[PDB]
């Protein structure tokens, strides 16, 4: 059976950078037969509403325990709205299930960390996809962190590609990894 | 489920006064996620729509987010997790004219209230 | 249950730029448990068989009604072959069903437009993936258009990346978005 | 029903270049309702552990027969561990089934070769996603080869983008194509 | 299901004549999609193959795709919808020599026919 | 027996410098292990950072043995009846720099087994 964990639509400012919520992260982890598809997008707020080319890189780490439950310790964590999306509606169900593990990155496949570095357009509609308005976002699968069993890291890089100050309104990003076995 | 008393309102106030913007809400037993409130503003000042002004998550208040309202917006209740997420915005001025919105999440609960000032 | 809407194999010249069919669009929208995968490829014809670096950018908009039925008004529209792919064969079934809605972009998730700007190789096998033979293709999810309830826009951009005249034979492109609830 | 063919976790040096096994290919072909997702990553060994900017391009071709069985003749072939992943564990089941055909690229949709050229980061975690540490990987769907009925080719290109010698440890790559009908 | 009568045939004609290329089809009640017709040419003259010369789509004809055939390709029936996609190719030249394909779709029906000229 | 497995999957071995080390890797198949036989030996040397470098391979009825420069020409499979259950190797003329954990990975799908030998070299 398939299963989706997510932030819900219209996500809260759930992305901390030095103990201040500054990124609004929409994150959706959908597990089908074997793979998990990460579908995510980000909107900066406050001091991170506009980013400039001198913006220093950063990681937003999700830390999960061995049963697929999001922990309190990562940059994105259990203190904000997170849970299961039932087929048929847009609610977020917080009550954990054993099926949640199936959204985690297969710990035998990813016994050492894996990564995907994709292009990440910023304010793409408004700037009409101008080439110098893209940064990079790298997913890091299972990089060790604290006492977490599984980790997903959205790492935002190479802001110095930007031609100038840009609204930090990212594209919809898509990654893929092999899901954990029940 | 989770809902707010009087989900739409309008409020008339003169310059200088402080404005009380209610957001009293009811939970349900099903609502076992974390409490997750934010107030936003759609000013008639700019095109800009829905800019955060004050936050509440992890039993912690984050307020520094909107320049024009710095030091002038705060939560009224001493126990907010009871169901009272009302804020007041003190020392009003004409640039505060707009639509203030209170989103309240407590998974799976979700509701919101609009107020025009 | 899952569902796929598509143009079928060997697609007709079904993409309008300026009231004339000029792009041959293969488009396949597959909905599994929760996400829809857009798998698409494009081949130019007539004056659009070869595009040059001075080619001006353009959008091919698909307009759908509230029940997931493709409307007649977009650049890609109900006047060309479009419908459901049965599991097990390559037919195109035009008879609408309530399940078709499941291929549409979730209108609560995408209550304001979202976008993904991907690299888009042109004639990639023949030019052996030469770097200056890629343009950009940006999917825009739910940008309002006329009386459509859902929209998907393939917007082709940055032709000035091309080193010269290139056969407008795009790579297979893949996007992802959250599907609508029944 | 869905079905996954793969190399298993911790793959052998299963990828041959000029008759010598030099690339360690993790390849996973997951078929869900309609599309096949290719999820793959590569690690070079021996002389291919480090690649330099002057590295010449190359193709790793998988050749499959008309029933979806991997043949012995490709660069990646039946002489190494390859088979079905049962839902629930990480074994590799070599006993062929008629369902295996469902992971092949639909021969009517891809009656002439299709391609997708993606960015392909190398040693991305270690070099922190530095822009000049990416090459390109192009998937070619159904380019004819020998007496194969279906082919999948991972073609690695544009090594001259590299700023210097780089550990040939690829990102996780994801491609998508329409699956064959039973 | 959707069919075209005589799916293959040779037609011979020297210079200047008007070639009539028949592509007449039978529908069935399954076939609910829009009538979507295409004629292509695979010339004996040169490299390329399968080139669009004329199409019928959304009850409207579009005709200038092959520069060499410009102005000398017209549909013959003023009632195609009824099952007659046949076309005329007037004032034949020797460069016209090749295979003319006729693809007719009406979802879910699809059918094509080839003609060697 | 019931699946693919190796005999004594963990083991130390001490030899002096110049002697050869016999690294046993004997394994049993089960009827269901119908995949291609796919052996490899790896070395995590103690001397430097790197871990799990290939030294020798058996695949498609051929031996590829080029991979680890330091061990060039000193590693050899010991049993010309390899397909029957014997992945054992010899490391001849032991060096001090041969100190490390040597690993034997045997695959014949769905079978997988592995064994590690921590090898030490004295004077
Ligand atoms: C914008 C910013 O603050 N960037 C710094 C970055 C961020 O604080 C965090 O990534 C937020 O998640 O941290 C950087 O380095 C690190 C970590 O790599 C390390 O584990 O701990 C140090 C503290 O010494 C710091 O968190 C980074 O991610 O590169 C430095 C960025 O400049
Ligand atoms: C090749 C070409 O004609 N490009 C023009 C482009 C296309 O015609 C359309 O995208 C086809 O769908 O239109 C461009 O601008 C627009 C629309 O974006 C706008 O909403 O309306 C104007 C008319 O005022 C025009 O249609 C574009 O999208 O870039 C202009 C291109 O030159
Ligand atoms: C690194 C290397 O060896 N590159 C050569 C490459 C590889 O050996 C193959 O890709 C191995 O898979 O072969 C190159 O071209 C080809 C084939 O495409 C062609 O069919 O035949 C020629 C010889 O006539 C050769 O095999 C390539 O793919 O680019 C040449 C590379 O330099």
Numbering used by the authors:
A (entry chain Q), C (entry chain S), D (entry chain R): 361 to 542
B (entry chain A), E (entry chain Z): 19 to 135
F (entry chain G): 17 to 139
Original authors' sentences:
At least in vitro and for most cell types, the fiber mediates the initial attachment to primary receptors, such as the D1 domain of the coxsackievirus and adenovirus receptor (CAR), sialic acids, CD46, and others (for review see Zhang & Bergelson). Our results showing that the CAV-2 fiber head contains a sialic acid binding site creates a paradox: both HAd37 and CAV-2 fiber heads contain CAR and sialic acid binding sites - but HAd37 uses sialic acid and CD46, while CAV-2 uses CAR (CAV-2 does not use CD46 to infect cells, unpublished data) to infect cells.
To determine if sialic acid and CAR binding were mutually exclusive, we soaked CAV-2 or HAd37 fiber head crystals in complex with CAR in solutions containing sialyl-D-lactose. Crystals containing the complex with CAV-2 fiber head diffracted to 2.9 Å and contained 12 chains of fiber head bound to 12 chains of CAR D1 and 12 sialyl-D-lactose molecules in the asymmetric unit (space group I422). For both structures the electron density maps showed clear density for sialic acid, but not lactose, at the expected positions on the fiber heads. With respect to CAR affinity, the CAV-2 fiber head binds human CAR with the highest affinity of any fiber head known, which may favor its efficient hemagglutination. We cannot exclude the possibility that in some cell types sialic acid binding provides a first low-affinity attachment to the cell surface, while CAR-binding is followed in a second step, providing a high-affinity binding. Unexpectedly, we found that the CAV-2 fiber head harbors a sialic acid binding site.
